[PDB]
Design a protein around this ligand. Structure first.
Ligand code: GDP
Ligand code: MG
Length: 197
């Protein structure tokens, strides 16, 4: 099996758990790692080069209280760092999480995700999201609650990890039905604003 340890980090409350849970079979099949305070969710995706499994390591909330134990990060092959676009301080802490990752991890592919784009009053707009430029990381807006752009971080990671910039998903995973509607007009403007930066 081609599988990848994916660590999912960022401040408490940014929507990490809600995000990983959109993949329904991953949530149904999640495996507890009680010795590290983690649930490993097997998010399978199907590509033109075959199935790939991201074993997404989701914390049990201990990030609220500081850095995670080395065992959490150890042998990660990729990461998503998340922040919440309605909470400036979570964008503020992104270089900190990054530093943890670079410190424990073997120079892995990292996607930065700004979550909760469905909330009307958005604080962290495209113009201010600059950290990924400084580090040549990929950034995406996401909304966990509406599945908006769910697949995009994993698509980017898979391209990087397999070293095939032409890899495509042949089908979408079964996702939890949207719990809020992400206005497609709002979504298109946000995509625009990110290009206009
Ligand atoms: N509106 C909205 N709320 C969200 C989204 N993702 C998470 N939340 C809410 O934000 C809070 C924290 O989510 P959680 O997944 O526990 O965050 P974590 O602590 O990073 O694992 C919860 O109240 C979620 O319902 C989202 O995409 N949109
Ligand atoms: Mg959580």
């Amino acid at each position: 099996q081609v599988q990848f340890k994916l660590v999912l980090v960022g401040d408490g409350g940014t929507g990490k758990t809600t995000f990983v849970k959109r993949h329904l079979t991953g949530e149904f099949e999640k495996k507890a790692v009680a010795t590290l305070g983690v649930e490993v969710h097997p998010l399978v995706f199907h590509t033109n080069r075959g199935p790939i499994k991201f074993n997404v390591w989701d914390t049990a909330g201990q990030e609220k209280f500081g850095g995670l134990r080395d065992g959490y990060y150890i042998q990660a092959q990729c990461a998503i760092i998340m922040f919440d676009v309605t909470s400036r301080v979570t964008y503020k802490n992104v270089p900190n999480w990054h530093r943890d990752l670079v410190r424990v991890c073997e120079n892995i592919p990292i996607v930065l995700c700004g979550n909760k784009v469905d909330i009307k009053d958005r604080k962290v707009k495209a113009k201010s999201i600059v950290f990924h430029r400084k580090k040549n990381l990929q950034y995406y807006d996401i909304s966990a609650k509406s599945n908006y752009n769910f697949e995009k971080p994993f698509l980017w990671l898979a391209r990087k990890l397999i070293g095939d910039p032409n890899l495509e998903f042949v089908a979408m995973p079964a996702l939890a039905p949207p719990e809020v509607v992400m206005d497609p007009a709002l979504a298109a403007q946000y995509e625009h604003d990110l290009e206009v930066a």
